Design a protein around this nucleic acid. Structure first.
Lengths: 75, 81, 74, 101, 84, 108, 93, 106, 169, 68
RNA sequence: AAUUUGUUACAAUACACAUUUUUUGGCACCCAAAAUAGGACGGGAAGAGACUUUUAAAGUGAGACGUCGCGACCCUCGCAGGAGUCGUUCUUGACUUUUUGGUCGCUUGAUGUUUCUCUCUUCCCGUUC
């Protein structure tokens, strides 16, 4: 019905937790009414910052159902 | 419904959040929608295991929210007439 | 802005291969060529293989439900 | 064609078609012919039940249904059977339902 | 109704102090307010009662009573309480 | 057709509402909402004992059962008795209705 | 203890102190004020009570005394998704 | 489901007559025929009571090994025994075979 | 008059004690000056309604006994009661405080009634009782109280608790 | 450019396996009909997790994927 | 020389909705422990074994978040959710200002999560046959 308001967030590098375990960081591109969030230059954060972190793809889309909290690391 | 309208009445005030993942986000509420998904400003975070951090801005999905703590003085607010 | 399902339509026509993560309970991730999709984000994948989490077996042209979708990643 | 375009009677003809011609026709033909059905729930407990009634959400009324549930701890198994004369079953728990010969 | 206490042990905790006060004042009458809202401590506590008579009695009896080392200075309040 | 409209004619009957937790509720039934929210009156709600060398029962259902305030201290097994429980609709799994009532009259 | 009206719905009861059960095994006790279509309700002065894991072991079948760790949170708004069942504790002031 | 007059052939006996001798199976039929009136709803409660049981497609009766059927007909008699009994007000012990037959046949 | 069920029913259970819990019951027309000469009978009429606090202050009660299983009850105010002995097995796990000021409890009678506990109460006031005057009464009360958080407003001194424990050993 | 619904309309009365999300169980059988929600009906199905099953109804929420 | 009837508006209840944001379920699983004909079970205290620490002598499985508490060589004055203003008449509305505890030890507060590995003797108090 109503679109979520991310309007200040887009183009800013953002960390968001996928499910209980996961945390993905990427530059937010677009979003929809289900909160499905597509972002680019995705990276999967882990305990060891440079080591266990591995990039996903040039463009990644996320189902809004697996989104828990969304924090922007940015202005 | 009244429960969501009270959340809209709590904008700009310090509120507490319990996500169903077990964490606790206490801080100032900037935005809220009728889907109960809110965004909070200058918020202290408590992980499910107790580790506490601080983040400037946060957006949470309403489906993952469990309870929201609202400043008590909203109890007598006109919604409940 | 690039709406997410627009991006998926750019996965359909650009014929780029995608890896897609499922829910954390199932323990497999699918990868293949996304052909077409519905409003519910349930997608048909041509030449798909299921990898447990590289010896996974090839699937086929397979319809995958959107309820179990977590990530769609190129 | 989406459902919000149709009128009040077109939904009734649509539900009549879906029950008569469709997947749930397996249950409907099972209700009229008095054929016992096997139902697996999410719980993992299987009921052999005769269907008095069913519905869109798949919730259904069964009479004389028998419940079969096994449990194991450290690979020690026991099979338990429970008989209830009347059952109303909410449809979200079920997964597979088969029609016995 | 209200009775403004003074000259008491500041070293004791707030909630505990309140509890103690409640315990003390239950003999005279029904204590409406457990502890003073300001909670500055160091004696300053307003024991709100239901009846004035009870309050009066309390004032009479517990004037310079030994509570946590020091003698409590009982006195009637200037302004009426918010609850009353 | 909404089969929930059947349950609304079962009012004032002894029933067991067997929930998703495994918790079972015996009680007299009152008005059932269109979402299948079921409100009962005099209810004894308990958890079955899987025997199986005393395998551990539901850990969440025991806590939720003691936290109703209706569990009495001297109960040897795990039960609680209380008046007026209101149950959300999505929690219900099975409903065992009495043997006496006839379906042919109520299922119309 | 307290006898609720034999036919009383969630609308009939207001300002009664309730006892709310969630899916996670914790309880919110307090005065109900509003509620909604999907049954997310507003409690006035609410205290969440929880059962200790050692306490949960004690609750297993054999006078029991459980130490129930609880914390006070005023004027909350619950979510209908989490709510499991509701019981009445007291009657209004 | 028939909106038109027509002749239709079906077998009342089904499994039980096929299993057990013909004199006895009519008697088991008559024990049933009295009973379903006295079983207003418990019929489908008692006949389906064993859910393992299924009705054959050609046949009408629930096909079974016939031991519960002897239990079914006995329970059904007791329902007939009480319903005939309660209207006239007789004790269950006072009921005798000559009375039990008079209940069956009358 | 005598503490009946009707009286209990009548009692004002509206104004909740906001310090802790809810439902601060005052039995009869008013528990403060009710004049219950006999022991607290008909406790079942309350039926553990609700740190549930009951004020029995300014009443004739001789014995702190006759309670029904009350899970909620955490606070007992018993001020101006002619208490002599308060031995019971009902209110054991329940209860966090006990105010016994201006009563008739004996130094030996109070000690005898409890019989000792591994853990009990948490707040206790025995002020204006004959026993408190008695020599080594504070030491005897600490030994009897077993575990205790307070003794007549002053906490049993940590060192005093240690010495009392040594006396017990 | 096939989408899901025409893909199910093209898979009618063909042999299709369906993997459920739980035990990695797949029902292999001839599809009969589908609903709007993609409820499934199957004939001559076989359960793989080894058995043979005459007729099957599969609710929409429990299926993981559908293949031919 | 207040009651009843009719009409209008508002509020509440029931006629709706299985497709990621609440009600047609991501569902379920760690595993194992009492039987007899003076005896068990719980709680508290003491001793010992095995654990830890120092170079024989010291207490009881170990390592990590918080939670409110026992001490204080510190700070600190001491009586006012409420307060002010304006409208209005003997206490009401509209508009503005914004919680004691601020901290440190704990010579083991006291106490819950989460990973790994493998108790006996003596006294005191309650319950049961």
């Amino acid at each position: 019905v109503s679109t979520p308001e991310l309007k200040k967030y887009m183009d800013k590098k953002i960390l968001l937790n996928i499910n209980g375990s996961r945390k993905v960081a990427g530059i937010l591109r677009g979003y929809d009414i289900f909160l499905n969030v597509v972002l680019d230059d995705a990276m999967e954060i882990n305990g060891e910052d440079p080591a266990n972190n591995h990039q996903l793809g040039l463009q990644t889309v996320i189902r809004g159902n697996s989104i828990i909290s969304l924090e922007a690391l940015d202005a | 419904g009244i429960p969501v309208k009270l959340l809209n009445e709590a904008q700009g005030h310090i509120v507490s959040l319990e996500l169903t993942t077990g964490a606790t986000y206490r801080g100032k509420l900037v935005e809220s929608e009728d889907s109960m998904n809110v965004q909070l400003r200058d918020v202290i975070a408590t992980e499910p295991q107790g580790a506490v951090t601080h983040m400037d801005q946060i957006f949470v999905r309403g489906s993952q929210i469990k309870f929201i703590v609202v400043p008590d003085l909203l109890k007598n607010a006109p919604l409940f007439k | 802005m690039v709406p997410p399902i627009n991006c998926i339509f750019n996965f359909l026509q650009q014929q780029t291969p995608v890896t897609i993560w499922l829910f954390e309970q199932i323990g497999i991730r699918i990868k293949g060529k996304i052909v077409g999709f519905d409003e519910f984000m349930n997608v048909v994948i041509d030449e798909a293989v299921e990898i447990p989490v590289e010896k996974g077996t090839p699937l086929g042209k397979i319809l995958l439900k959107g309820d179990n979708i977590t990530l769609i990643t190129s | 064609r989406p459902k919000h375009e149709l009128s009040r009677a077109e939904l009734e003809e649509l539900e009549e078609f879906e029950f008569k011609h469709g997947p749930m026709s397996l249950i409907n033909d099972a209700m009229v012919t008095r054929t016992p059905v096997i139902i697996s729930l999410r719980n993992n407990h299987k009921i052999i039940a005769r269907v008095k009634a069913f519905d869109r959400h798949c919730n259904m009324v069964l009479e004389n249904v028998k419940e079969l549930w096994t449990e194991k701890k450290g690979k020690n198994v026991i099979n338990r059977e429970r008989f209830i004369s009347k059952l109303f079953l909410r449809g979200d728990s079920v997964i597979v339902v088969l029609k016995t010969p | 109704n209200t009775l403004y206490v003074s000259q008491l042990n500041e070293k004791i905790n707030m909630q505990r102090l309140r509890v103690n006060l409640f315990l003390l004042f239950a003999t005279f009458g029904e204590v409406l307010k457990v502890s003073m809202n300001f909670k500055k401590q160091r004696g300053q506590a307003f024991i709100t009662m239901r009846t004035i008579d009870q309050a009066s009695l309390a004032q009479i009896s517990l004037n310079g009573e030994r509570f946590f080392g020091k003698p409590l200075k009982v006195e009637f309040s200037k302004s009426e309480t918010k609850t009353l | 057709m909404k089969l929930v409209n059947f349950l609304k004619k079962l009012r004032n009957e002894q029933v067991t509402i067997e929930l998703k937790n495994g918790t079972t509720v015996w009680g007299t039934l009152q008005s059932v909402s269109p979402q299948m929210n079921a409100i009962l009156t005099d209810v004894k709600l308990t958890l079955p004992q899987p025997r199986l060398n005393k395998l551990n029962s539901n850990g969440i259902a025991m806590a939720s059962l003691y936290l109703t305030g209706g569990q009495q201290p001297t109960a040897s097994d795990n039960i609680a008795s209380l008046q007026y429980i209101n149950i959300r609709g999505n929690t219900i799994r099975q409903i065992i209705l009495p043997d006496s009532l006839n379906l042919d009259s109520l299922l119309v | 203890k307290i006898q609720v009206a034999h036919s009383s719905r969630l609308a009939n009861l207001i300002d009664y102190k309730l006892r709310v059960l969630t899916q996670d095994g914790r309880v919110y006790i307090g005065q109900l004020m509003a509620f909604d279509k999907h049954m997310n309700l507003v409690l006035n002065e609410c205290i969440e009570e929880r059962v200790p894991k050692t306490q949960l072991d004690k609750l297993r079948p054999r006078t029991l005394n459980i130490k129930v760790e609880k914390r006070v949170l005023g004027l909350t708004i619950l979510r209908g998704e989490q709510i499991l069942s509701t019981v009445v504790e007291d009657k209004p002031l | 489901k028939a909106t038109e007059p027509q002749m239709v052939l079906f077998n009342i006996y089904d499994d039980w007559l096929d299993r057990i001798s013909s004199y006895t199976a009519f008697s088991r039929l008559t024990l049933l025929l009295r009973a379903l009136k006295t079983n207003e709803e418990s019929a489908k409660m008692i006949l389906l009571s064993d859910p393992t049981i299924t009705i054959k497609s050609y046949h009408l009766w629930p096909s079974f090994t016939d031991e519960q059927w002897i239990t079914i007909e006995s329970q059904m008699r007791d329902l007939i025994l009480t319903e005939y009994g309660r209207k006239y007000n007789v004790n269950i012990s006072a009921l005798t075979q000559t009375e039990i037959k008079d209940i069956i046949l009358g | 008059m005598k503490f009946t069920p009707s009286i209990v029913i009548d009692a004002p259970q509206y104004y909740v004690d906001h310090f802790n819990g809810k439902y601060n019951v005052d039995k009869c027309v008013i528990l403060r000056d009710l004049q219950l000469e006999t022991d607290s009978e008909s406790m079942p009429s309350s039926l553990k309604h609700l740190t549930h606090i009951l004020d029995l202050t300014n009443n004739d009660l001789i014995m702190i006994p006759d309670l029904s299983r009350r899970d909620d009850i955490h606070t007992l105010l018993l001020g101006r009661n002619n208490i002599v002995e308060v031995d019971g097995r009902l209110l054991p796990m329940n209860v966090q405080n006990l105010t016994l000021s201006n009563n008739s409890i004996r130094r030996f009678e109070d000690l005898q009634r409890l019989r000792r506990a591994p853990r009990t109460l948490k707040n206790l006031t025995l002020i204006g009782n004959q026993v408190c005057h008695l020599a080594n009464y504070r030491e005897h009360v600490l030994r009897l109280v077993p575990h205790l958080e307070t003794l007549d407003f002053q906490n049993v001194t940590a060192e005093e608790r240690k010495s009392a424990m040594s006396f017990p050993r | 450019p096939v989408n899901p619904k025409p893909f199910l309309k093209g898979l009618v009365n063909h042999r299709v396996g369906v993997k459920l999300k739980f035990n990695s169980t797949e029902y292999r059988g001839t599809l009969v009909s589908t609903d709007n929600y993609f409820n499934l009906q199957l004939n001559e199905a076989e359960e793989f997790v080894h058995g043979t099953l005459g007729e099957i109804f599969i609710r929409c929420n429990n299926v993981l994927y559908i293949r031919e």
